[PDB]
Design a protein around this nucleic acid. Structure first.
Lengths: 325, 218
RNA sequence: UUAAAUCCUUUAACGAGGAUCCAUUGGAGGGCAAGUCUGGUGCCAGCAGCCGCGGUAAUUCCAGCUCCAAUAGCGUAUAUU
RNA sequence: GAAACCAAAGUCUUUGGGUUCCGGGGGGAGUAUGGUUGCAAAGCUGAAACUUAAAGGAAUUGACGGAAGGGCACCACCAGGAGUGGAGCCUGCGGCUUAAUUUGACUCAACACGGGAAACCUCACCCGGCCCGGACACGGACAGGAUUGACAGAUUGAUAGCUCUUUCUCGAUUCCGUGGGUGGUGGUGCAUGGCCGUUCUAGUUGGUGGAGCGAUUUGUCUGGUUAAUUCCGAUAACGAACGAGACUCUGGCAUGCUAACUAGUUACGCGACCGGUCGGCGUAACUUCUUAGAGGGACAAGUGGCGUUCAGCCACCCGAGAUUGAGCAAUAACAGGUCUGUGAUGCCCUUAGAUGUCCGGGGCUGCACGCGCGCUACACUGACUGGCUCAGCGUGUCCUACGCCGGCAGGCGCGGGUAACCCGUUGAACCCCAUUCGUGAUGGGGAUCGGGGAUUGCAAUUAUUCCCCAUGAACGAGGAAUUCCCAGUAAGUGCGGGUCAUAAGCUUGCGUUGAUUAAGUCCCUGCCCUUUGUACACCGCGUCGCU
């Protein structure tokens, strides 16, 4: 849980700055880009290693710290807390392979769903691929909700976290019986034609990516696999998804289809496949920026002398040599 | 047990070469450690000047190996200096000692004032230049003692010089260069020509040329 | 003794067994002579001319013990060679 | 000469040919201020306060290249097979419960690892209950017994002489209270004495000589070649040691040899049966089969091609085998260490026993869920029913033959085997051959349940396991994703070992039926060489509010 709520923001963000450019970030660089408090950040790092926030690395010459899987997760929730979306944690968690579903509650008490991308090449690249995944998923989530589609409502995105509307139900793969099989079938078949009208093919439109809300309403999730209709095999991915649903309702619910939708309509809807002159106030700001940069460069060279590990190794052998002589 | 390899060595083994001076007269290379250990014997004491540990850059990583600076010296005659690097420290030391015995040089001893008694000081002010270290030895009056830094103090003591004014210039802190400079200075004592050695040098037969018939049998 | 004294010198008596008639100041990683001893502390307190020591086995801090240097002296700051 | 380099940058501690300018750790700073020159922009001259253990120059190895070339790997892909992931069940890890659900490891080396199949033990876990727990010093009791041992009966969850009736014996083997440090079937830490495991699997390391003030380099390499510091060979190197290699075994081959009363064949007698069949029985044939030994046998032997015409590489004939697999072989790094070794060893603990022994009952299986290895399936290339015929690795003083009683698990009687002898020609399953079923949740599939019976055992209730009836669920070839796989291999299919009283969907071996595709590549995923370069620089986080 989150108790510490001051210096932990600045130190962890400073790691993320170094993570985008380099692998393991040395402790010398951290304090320079987090200049608000000086000296006492080294004990904060020792509190960060207690939790699964940062990992230590002392291989051969490389001495420093790298951000963990769970440590990257805490940073997004800390940003979402300032945007007043997340306050307390709900416990109903569906631990998946590509993502983790966490229930979140706001100031109001209204429960929302949170998605956290867990892509698992070094861990630096793995925590960068999760960044691009959430930004792509939120892009489709906004694009479909605006265009009448039955998708969860997009709220906020932070690095890898995506806040969505809480639609609670069961996935189609674990459904025994539906009270009205025909009405549910026609609803699902319409949504494939709907996407094709907007110039989109789902690709993997199966029973594993569909959730029923009280056996009345079909909800769609997971959107990183979507392709354009400009693709040469556009009708192939269209027909494969149709046959997947055609066979499933005949298999599980024993419903044979009377309507066979195979229409190519591109595009009647929006193409979503793309988706003295200088005042003294300014003089003061400019002088300040110059004077801070001169101090920051000097502090970097003071911190680069921390090598402490090199001095410790040299001292051990000297004691052995003098005793043997 | 010693079994000599060189021709010089074989001569030494027997009784054909009487002193160590007959080797220095013909500037023959002493290639065996035993030759020195035969002539000077119990008289050669040793001082370990420094044991500096260095880490060798290897593809397997870093391992510790020790560099030993040993100055061997028979008093009132002969000095040598050796530098060895090895895994263990004792090994390094013995290696250095062996190496320092191969490097034994005679030092010429002079007089400061009037030449009364035994010689005690360096004959004339000599110098030893070794990689930015410049050691100067200067003739001192009898009983002054060696007025120097600790290392050339040692080296001069084990040379059998009783008294000498020293002066060093440059980076005297690097021990190898300092000791090697002082050794180089002290060697140069015989190389310096005085009015004492102006007489035409009458040539004795070389150890090889004299005992040629004895070397036929081996 | 001395102006008169005092001190020194000279001398009667009393005056020495270790809990005394009890020696101190700095230091003990390296420079630099002397502990990987024991307890305490846990990048805190602090030390450290400089190099550095301390973030739980501290040869560097506060103590104890032990040892070393100088010795009725020995540290510290400053001017200067 | 720090050196790269320099006939000057030489003739410098062996320091003095004349002479001008000029530097004294880095910054602040070539900034302020003054002066002066300048139309101006500016130039020349030119500080301090203060701040900092460094700022730098040469050279040298190459941790890392987001550098380049090669090479290799189904723990990589390609063409594919079997799949898992979907279903039920079983198990492991999370998580969840609970008095307890004992437990280290979490992308290989986390994941049926502790041989861990846990009714008891194992058991470390929980709820309970008896029992006593040192030496020492002080104060009390004992010969007018300190104390031990003790038949039967009554007690609590237990045949508790560790309580009462019994007090009957046993002769100091003492026990009753209080404590203070000097507690030892102690715990851990260090000095030292012996012995292990971990990563790849190809290097590692001296000695002497040479080069450099030295770090270092040469040896350890142009080229070809090799898995390779391998080899040919070139050469400021020459020689080594260590490991890989070599050594040894093993397997493939022998109608050559040595033998086999616990191996087998052939022939010959006798018998049984219809000139033949007989795992029926009895010694002349010696090794084909079986065994277990010796000796052979393959060495790049030969031919062809390619190759500095050498080292070697590729192809092919004959051959059992032309590229068998293991150990040895007794490396490098370990700061992982290991163990009843010694130190009047350093500390910490010892009615806070470093898990005190025992007693009874529980738990390890508990269950909405995730993540995973498996088993059975999803039928027609099948299921059922009858008939037929073939193993090998192995085991055994519980393995079991044989008769009888049993629908069935099983009982009862009697033998052999401490084992090429008996189980046992191991009588296997798949498969084959016929019979019935007929595309349906079907007789496929068997979960879950309901009654009996039988063992195993001190004990089966939370079903040990097996048997017989009845119920008969999900499951219609499984999405993203992912594992193993080059030939007697994958996959189907049974059997044996392993813990063991009964306990086996596990692990580990063995046979048996036996494939598709491939003989390529670096595309992905990685790993390994070689060559070459190398000791987070600069330009793009703020606003306001009172003391």
């Amino acid at each position: 849980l989150r108790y510490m709520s001051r210096d932990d923001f600045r130190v962890l963000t400073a790691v993320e700055m170094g993570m985008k450019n380099h692998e393991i970030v040395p402790g010398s660089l951290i304090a320079s880009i987090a200049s608000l408090k000086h000296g006492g950040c080294n004990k904060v790092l020792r509190e960060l290693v207690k939790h699964k926030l940062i990992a230590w690395e002392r291989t051969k010459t490389v001495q420093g710290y790298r951000l963990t899987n769970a440590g990257y997760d805490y940073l997004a929730l800390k940003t979402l807390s300032s945007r007043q979306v997340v306050e307390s944690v709900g416990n109903q968690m569906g631990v998946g392979k590509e993502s983790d579903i966490y229930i979140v509650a706001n100031e109001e008490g209204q429960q929302f769903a949170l998605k956290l991308h867990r892509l698992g090449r070094h861990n630096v690249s793995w925590l960068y691929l999760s960044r691009l995944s959430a930004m792509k998923e939120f892009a489709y989530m906004k694009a479909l909700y605006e265009r009448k589609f039955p998708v969860p409502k997009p709220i906020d995105y932070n690095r890898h976290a995506v806040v969505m509307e809480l639609i609670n139900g069961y996935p189609l793969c674990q459904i025994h019986h539906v009270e009205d099989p025909a009405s549910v079938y026609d609803e699902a078949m319409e949504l494939i034609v709907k996407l094709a009208n907007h110039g989109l093919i789902h690709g993997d439109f199966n029973e594993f990516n569909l959730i029923l809300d009280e056996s009345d309403h079909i909800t769609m999730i997971d959107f990183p696999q979507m392709v354009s209709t400009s693709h040469p095999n556009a009708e192939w991915y269209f027909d494969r998804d149709v046959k997947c649903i055609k066979d499933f309702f005949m298999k599980r619910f024993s419903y044979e289809s009377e309507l066979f939708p195979t229409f190519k309509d591109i595009r009647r809807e929006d193409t979503l496949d793309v988706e003295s002159t200088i005042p003294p106030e300014l003089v003061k700001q400019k002088v300040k920026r110059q004077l801070t940069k001169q101090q920051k460069s000097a502090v970097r060279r003071r911190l680069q002398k921390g090598a402490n590990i090199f001095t410790k190794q040299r001292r051990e052998n000297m004691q052995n040599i003098k005793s043997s002589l | 047990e010693w079994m000599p390899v060189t021709k010089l060595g074989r001569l030494v083994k027997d009784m054909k070469i009487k002193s160590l001076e007959e080797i220095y007269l013909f500037s023959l290379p002493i290639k065996e450690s035993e030759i020195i250990d035969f002539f000077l014997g119990a008289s050669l004491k040793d001082e370990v000047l420094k044991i500096m540990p260095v880490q060798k850059q290897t593809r397997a990583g870093q391992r510790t190996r020790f560099k030993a600076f040993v100055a061997i010296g028979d008093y009132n005659g002969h000095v040598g200096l050796g530098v060895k690097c090895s895994k263990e420290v004792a090994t390094a030391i013995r290696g250095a000692i062996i190496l320092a015995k191969l490097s034994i040089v005679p030092v010429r001893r002079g007089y400061w004032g009037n030449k009364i008694g035994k010689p005690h000081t360096v004959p004339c002010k000599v110098t030893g230049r070794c990689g930015s270290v410049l050691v100067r030895l200067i003739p001192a009056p009898r009983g002054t003692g060696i007025v120097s830094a600790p290392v050339p103090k040692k080296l001069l003591m084990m040379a059998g010089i009783d008294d000498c004014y020293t002066s060093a210039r440059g980076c005297t802190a690097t021990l190898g260069n300092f000791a090697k400079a002082t050794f180089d200075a002290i060697s140069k004592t015989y190389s310096y020509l005085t009015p004492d050695l102006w007489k035409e040098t009458v040539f004795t037969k070389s150890p090889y040329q004299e005992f040629t018939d004895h070397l036929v049998k081996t």
